[PDB]
mmCIF file of C-alpha atoms and ligand atoms in Angstrom:
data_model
loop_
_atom_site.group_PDB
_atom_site.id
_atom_site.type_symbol
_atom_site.label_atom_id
_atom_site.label_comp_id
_atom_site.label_asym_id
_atom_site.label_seq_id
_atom_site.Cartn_x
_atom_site.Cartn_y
_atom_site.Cartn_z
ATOM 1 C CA UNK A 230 20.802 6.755 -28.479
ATOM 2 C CA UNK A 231 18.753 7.555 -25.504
ATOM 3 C CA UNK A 232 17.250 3.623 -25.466
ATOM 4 C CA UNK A 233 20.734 3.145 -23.963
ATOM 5 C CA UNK A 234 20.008 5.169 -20.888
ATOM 6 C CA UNK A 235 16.921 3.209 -20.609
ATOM 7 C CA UNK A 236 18.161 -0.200 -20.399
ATOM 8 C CA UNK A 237 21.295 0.763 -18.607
ATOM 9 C CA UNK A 238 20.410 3.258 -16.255
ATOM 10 C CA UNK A 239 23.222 1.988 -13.521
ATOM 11 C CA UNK A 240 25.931 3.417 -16.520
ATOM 12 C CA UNK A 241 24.344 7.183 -16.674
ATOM 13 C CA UNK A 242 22.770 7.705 -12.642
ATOM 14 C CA UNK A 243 25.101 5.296 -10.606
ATOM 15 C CA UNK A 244 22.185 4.187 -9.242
ATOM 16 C CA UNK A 245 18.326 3.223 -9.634
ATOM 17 C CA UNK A 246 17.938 3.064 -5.693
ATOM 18 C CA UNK A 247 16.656 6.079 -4.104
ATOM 19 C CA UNK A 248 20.367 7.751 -4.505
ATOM 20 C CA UNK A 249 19.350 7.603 -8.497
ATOM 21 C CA UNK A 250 16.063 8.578 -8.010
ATOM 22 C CA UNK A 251 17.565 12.141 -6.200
ATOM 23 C CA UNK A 252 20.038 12.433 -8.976
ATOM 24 C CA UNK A 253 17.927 13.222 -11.240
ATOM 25 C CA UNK A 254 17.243 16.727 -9.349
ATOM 26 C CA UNK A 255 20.892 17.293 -9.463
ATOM 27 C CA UNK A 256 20.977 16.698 -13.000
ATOM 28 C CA UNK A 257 18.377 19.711 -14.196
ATOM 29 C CA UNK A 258 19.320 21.819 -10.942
ATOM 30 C CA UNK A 259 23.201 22.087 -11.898
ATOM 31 C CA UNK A 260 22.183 23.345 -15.323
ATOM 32 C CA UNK A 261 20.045 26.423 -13.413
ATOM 33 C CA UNK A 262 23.095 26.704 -11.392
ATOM 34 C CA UNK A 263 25.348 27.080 -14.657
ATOM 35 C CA UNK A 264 22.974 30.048 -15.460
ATOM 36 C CA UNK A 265 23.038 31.400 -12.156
ATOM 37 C CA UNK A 266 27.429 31.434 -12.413
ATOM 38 C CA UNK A 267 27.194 32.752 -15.924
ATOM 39 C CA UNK A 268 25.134 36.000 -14.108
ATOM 40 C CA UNK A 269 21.714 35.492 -15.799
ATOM 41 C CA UNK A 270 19.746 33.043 -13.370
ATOM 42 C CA UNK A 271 18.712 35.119 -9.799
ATOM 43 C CA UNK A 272 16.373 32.754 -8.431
ATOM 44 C CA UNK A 273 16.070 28.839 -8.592
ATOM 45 C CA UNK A 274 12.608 26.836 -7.054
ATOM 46 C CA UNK A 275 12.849 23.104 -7.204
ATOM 47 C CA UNK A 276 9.389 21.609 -5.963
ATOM 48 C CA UNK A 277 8.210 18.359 -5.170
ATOM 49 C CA UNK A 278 4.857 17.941 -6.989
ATOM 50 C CA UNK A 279 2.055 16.064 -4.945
ATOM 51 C CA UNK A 280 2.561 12.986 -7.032
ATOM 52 C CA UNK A 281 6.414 12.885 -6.550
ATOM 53 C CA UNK A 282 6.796 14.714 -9.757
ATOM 54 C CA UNK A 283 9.568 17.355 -9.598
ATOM 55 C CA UNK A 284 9.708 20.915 -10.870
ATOM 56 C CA UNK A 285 12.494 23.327 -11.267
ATOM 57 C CA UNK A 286 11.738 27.070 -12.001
ATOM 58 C CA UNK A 287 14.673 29.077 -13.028
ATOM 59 C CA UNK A 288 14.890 32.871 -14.332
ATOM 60 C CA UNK A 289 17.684 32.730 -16.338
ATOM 61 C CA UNK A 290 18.025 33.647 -20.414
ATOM 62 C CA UNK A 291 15.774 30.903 -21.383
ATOM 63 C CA UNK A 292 17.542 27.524 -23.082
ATOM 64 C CA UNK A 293 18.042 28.809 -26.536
ATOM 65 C CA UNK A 294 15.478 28.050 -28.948
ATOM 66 C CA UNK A 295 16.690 28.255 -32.465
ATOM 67 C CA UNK A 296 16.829 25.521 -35.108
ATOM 68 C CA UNK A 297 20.948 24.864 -35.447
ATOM 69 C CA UNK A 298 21.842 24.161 -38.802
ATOM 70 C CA UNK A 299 23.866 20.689 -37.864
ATOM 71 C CA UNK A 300 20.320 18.933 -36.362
ATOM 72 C CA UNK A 301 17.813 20.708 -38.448
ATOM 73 C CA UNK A 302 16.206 20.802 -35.045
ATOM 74 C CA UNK A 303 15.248 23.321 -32.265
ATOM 75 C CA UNK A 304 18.451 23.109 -30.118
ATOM 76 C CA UNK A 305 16.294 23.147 -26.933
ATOM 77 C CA UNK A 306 14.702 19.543 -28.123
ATOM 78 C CA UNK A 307 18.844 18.462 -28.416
ATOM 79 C CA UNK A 308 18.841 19.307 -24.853
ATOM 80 C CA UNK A 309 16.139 16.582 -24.125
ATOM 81 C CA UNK A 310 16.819 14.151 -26.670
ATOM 82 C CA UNK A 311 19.912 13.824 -27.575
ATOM 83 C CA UNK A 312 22.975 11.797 -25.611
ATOM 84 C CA UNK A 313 25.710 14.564 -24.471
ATOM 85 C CA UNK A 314 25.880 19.767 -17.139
ATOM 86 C CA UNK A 315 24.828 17.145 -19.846
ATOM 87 C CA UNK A 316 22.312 15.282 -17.618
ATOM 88 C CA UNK A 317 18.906 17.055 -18.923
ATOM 89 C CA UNK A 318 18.515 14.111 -21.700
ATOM 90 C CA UNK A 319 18.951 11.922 -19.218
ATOM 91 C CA UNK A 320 16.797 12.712 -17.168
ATOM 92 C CA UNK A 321 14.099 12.888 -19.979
ATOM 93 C CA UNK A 322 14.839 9.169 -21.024
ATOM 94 C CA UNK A 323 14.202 8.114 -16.973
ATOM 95 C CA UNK A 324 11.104 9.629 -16.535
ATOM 96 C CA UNK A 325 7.643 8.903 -18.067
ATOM 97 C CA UNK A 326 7.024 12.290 -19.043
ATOM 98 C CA UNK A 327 9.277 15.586 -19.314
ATOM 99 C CA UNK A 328 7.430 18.833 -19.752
ATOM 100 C CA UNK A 329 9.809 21.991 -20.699
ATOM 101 C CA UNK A 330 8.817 25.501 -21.250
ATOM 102 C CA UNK A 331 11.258 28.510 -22.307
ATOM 103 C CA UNK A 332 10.434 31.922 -20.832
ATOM 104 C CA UNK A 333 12.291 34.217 -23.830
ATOM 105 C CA UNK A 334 11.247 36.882 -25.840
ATOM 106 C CA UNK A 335 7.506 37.254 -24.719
ATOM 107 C CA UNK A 336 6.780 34.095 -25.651
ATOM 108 C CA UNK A 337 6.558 30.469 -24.026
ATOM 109 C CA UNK A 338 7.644 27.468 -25.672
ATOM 110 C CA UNK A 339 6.794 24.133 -24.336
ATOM 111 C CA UNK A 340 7.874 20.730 -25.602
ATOM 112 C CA UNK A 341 6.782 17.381 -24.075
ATOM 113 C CA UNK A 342 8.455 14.044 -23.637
ATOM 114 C CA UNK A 343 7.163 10.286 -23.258
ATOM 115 C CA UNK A 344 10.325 8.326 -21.619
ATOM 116 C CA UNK A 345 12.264 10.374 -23.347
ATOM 117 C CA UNK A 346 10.406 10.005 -26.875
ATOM 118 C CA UNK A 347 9.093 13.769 -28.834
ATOM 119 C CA UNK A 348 5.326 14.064 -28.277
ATOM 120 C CA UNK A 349 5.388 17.191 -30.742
ATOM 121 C CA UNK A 350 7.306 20.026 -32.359
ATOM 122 C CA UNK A 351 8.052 22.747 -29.767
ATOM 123 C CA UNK A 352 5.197 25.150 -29.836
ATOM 124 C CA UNK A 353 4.681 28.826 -28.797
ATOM 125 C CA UNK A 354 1.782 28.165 -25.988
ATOM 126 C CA UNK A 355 1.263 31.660 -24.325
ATOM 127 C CA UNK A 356 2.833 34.981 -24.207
ATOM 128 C CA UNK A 357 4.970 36.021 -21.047
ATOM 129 C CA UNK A 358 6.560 38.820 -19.484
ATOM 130 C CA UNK A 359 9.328 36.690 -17.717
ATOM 131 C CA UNK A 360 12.272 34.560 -18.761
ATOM 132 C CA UNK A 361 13.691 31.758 -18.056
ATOM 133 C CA UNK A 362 13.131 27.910 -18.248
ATOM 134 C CA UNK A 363 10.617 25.626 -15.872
ATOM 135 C CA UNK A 364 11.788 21.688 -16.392
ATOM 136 C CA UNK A 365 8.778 19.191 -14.704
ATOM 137 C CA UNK A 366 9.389 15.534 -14.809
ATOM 138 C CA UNK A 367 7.908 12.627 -13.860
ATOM 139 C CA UNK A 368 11.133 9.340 -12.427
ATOM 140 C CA UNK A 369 9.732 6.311 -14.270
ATOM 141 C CA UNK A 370 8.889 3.232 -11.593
ATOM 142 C CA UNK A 371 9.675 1.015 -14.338
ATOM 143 C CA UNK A 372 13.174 2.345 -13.658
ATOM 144 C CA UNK A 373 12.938 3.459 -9.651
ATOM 145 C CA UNK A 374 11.789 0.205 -9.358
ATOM 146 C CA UNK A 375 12.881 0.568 -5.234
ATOM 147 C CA UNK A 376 11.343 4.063 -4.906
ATOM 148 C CA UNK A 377 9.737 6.779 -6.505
ATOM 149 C CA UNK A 378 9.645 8.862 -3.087
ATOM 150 C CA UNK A 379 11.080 11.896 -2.680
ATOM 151 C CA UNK A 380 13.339 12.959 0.812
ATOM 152 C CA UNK A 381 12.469 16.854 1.483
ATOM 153 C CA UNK A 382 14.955 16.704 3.828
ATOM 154 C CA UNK A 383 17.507 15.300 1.815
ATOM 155 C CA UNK A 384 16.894 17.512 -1.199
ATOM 156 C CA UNK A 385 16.636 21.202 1.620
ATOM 157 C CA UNK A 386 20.059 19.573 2.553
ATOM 158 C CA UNK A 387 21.930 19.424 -0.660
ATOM 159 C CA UNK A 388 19.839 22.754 -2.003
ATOM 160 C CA UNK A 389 21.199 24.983 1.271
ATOM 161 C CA UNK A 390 24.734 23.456 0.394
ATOM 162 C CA UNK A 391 24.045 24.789 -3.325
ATOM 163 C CA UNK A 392 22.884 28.334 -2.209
ATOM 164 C CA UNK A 393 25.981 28.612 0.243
ATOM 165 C CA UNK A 394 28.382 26.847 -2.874
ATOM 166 C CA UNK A 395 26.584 29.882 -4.845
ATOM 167 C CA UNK A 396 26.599 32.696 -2.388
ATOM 168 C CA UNK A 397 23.964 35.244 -3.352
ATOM 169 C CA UNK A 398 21.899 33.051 -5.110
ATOM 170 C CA UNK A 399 18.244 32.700 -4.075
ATOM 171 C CA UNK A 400 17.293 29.422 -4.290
ATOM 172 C CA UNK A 401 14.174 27.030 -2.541
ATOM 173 C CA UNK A 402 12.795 23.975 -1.810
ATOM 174 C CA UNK A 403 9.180 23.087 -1.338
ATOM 175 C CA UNK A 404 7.268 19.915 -0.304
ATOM 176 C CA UNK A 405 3.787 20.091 -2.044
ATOM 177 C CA UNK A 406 2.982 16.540 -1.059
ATOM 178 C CA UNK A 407 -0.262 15.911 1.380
ATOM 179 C CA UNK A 408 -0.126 16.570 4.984
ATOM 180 C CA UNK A 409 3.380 17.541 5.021
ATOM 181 C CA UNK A 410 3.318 20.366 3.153
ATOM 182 C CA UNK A 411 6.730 22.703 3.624
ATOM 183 C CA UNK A 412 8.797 25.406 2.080
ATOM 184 C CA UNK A 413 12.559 26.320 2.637
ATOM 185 C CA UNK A 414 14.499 29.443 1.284
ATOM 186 C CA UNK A 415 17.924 29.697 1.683
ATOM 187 C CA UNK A 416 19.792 33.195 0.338
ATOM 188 C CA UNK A 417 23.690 33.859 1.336
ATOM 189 C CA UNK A 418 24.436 37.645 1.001
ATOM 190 C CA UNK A 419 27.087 39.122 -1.052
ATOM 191 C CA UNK A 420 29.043 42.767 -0.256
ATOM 192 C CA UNK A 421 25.517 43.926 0.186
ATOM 193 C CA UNK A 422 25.515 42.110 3.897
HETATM 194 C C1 SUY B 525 15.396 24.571 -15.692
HETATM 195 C C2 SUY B 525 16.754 23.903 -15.881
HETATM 196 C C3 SUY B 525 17.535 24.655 -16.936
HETATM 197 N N1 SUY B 525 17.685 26.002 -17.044
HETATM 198 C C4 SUY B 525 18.446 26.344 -18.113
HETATM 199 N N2 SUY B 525 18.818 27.556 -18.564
HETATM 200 C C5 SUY B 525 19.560 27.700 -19.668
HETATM 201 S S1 SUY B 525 19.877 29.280 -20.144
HETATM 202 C C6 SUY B 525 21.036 29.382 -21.385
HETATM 203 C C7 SUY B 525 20.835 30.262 -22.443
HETATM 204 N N3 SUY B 525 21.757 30.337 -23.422
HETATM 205 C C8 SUY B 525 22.874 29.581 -23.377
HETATM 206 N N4 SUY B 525 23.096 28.730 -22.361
HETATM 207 C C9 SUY B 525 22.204 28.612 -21.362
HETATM 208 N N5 SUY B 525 20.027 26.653 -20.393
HETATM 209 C C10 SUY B 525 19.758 25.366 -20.090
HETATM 210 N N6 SUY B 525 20.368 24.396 -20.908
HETATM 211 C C11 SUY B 525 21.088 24.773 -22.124
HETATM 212 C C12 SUY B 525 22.158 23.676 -22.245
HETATM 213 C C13 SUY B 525 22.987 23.486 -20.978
HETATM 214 N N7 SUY B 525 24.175 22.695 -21.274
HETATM 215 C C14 SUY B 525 21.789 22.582 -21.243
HETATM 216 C C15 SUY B 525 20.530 23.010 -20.488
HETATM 217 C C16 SUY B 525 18.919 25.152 -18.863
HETATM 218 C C17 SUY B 525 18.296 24.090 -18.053
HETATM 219 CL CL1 SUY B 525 18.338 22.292 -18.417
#
């Protein structure tokens, strides 16, 4: 399964250069993007954590939860875990740790990852008022062997291409990282303008 991705990265990212490394975004962004074009998702942050970590906050539905009758298994932890706008297991398997929690229903579940192994059964952790889904995840140097240092400008690039792709969209970039610390938010208007 997943090992795969491990061991042959160069198959599933193109790349384990800093191209790879960016991909990754991509990868969990696209999938708030899908939410945005199916008219749930508003508002999309992707953040670049002081440690090169990477967050992306979305307020769409909220990946569904529910154990599916094929897996036996929440279909969320699929998502992560299982080999399939199919990227987000990837992703998991390339990063030391993957952190998801699902805004839905007044309740947050959260599920952790360990290069791309199940630290526990998903668990409600808190109560909420919003939805939607927050991914964090941490590239693995043992992959990004080259770099594990994220380009703000690079990403602002590609996520103002994305909110102009997406017109009406509100989506941003921020740079959390020390001494350099930035924020970017791009919204294209609609037949409001
Ligand atoms: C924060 C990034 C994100 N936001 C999402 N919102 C949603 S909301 C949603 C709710 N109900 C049905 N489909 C999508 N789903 C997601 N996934 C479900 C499945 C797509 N192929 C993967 C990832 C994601 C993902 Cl991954």
């Amino acid at each position: 399964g997943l090992e795969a991705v491990r061991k042959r990265p160069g198959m599933y990212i193109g790349s384990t250069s800093g191209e790879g490394l960016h991909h990754l975004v991509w990868e969990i962004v696209d999938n708030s993007i899908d939410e945005a074009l199916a008219g749930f998702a508003k508002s999309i942050q992707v953040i670049i954590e002081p440690d090169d970590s990477i967050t992306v906050i979305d307020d769409g539905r909220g990946i569904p939860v529910g154990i599916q009758a094929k897996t036996g298994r929440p279909a969320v932890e699929t998502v992560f875990t299982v080999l399939h706008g199919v990227g987000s297991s990837v992703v998991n398997a390339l990063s030391t740790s993957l952190d998801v929690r699902v805004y839905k229903d007044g309740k947050v579940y959260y599920q952790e990852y360990r290069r791309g192994a199940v630290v526990d059964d998903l668990k409600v952790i808190e109560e909420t008022d919003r939805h939607g889904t927050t991914v964090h995840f941490i590239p693995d140097p043992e992959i990004f062997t080259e770099t594990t240092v994220y380009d703000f400008d690079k990403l602002a690039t590609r996520v103002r291409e994305l909110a102009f792709l997406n017109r009406g969209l509100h989506i941003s970039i921020e740079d959390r990282r020390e001494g350099q610390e930035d924020k970017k938010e791009y919204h294209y208007e609609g037949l409001e303008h």
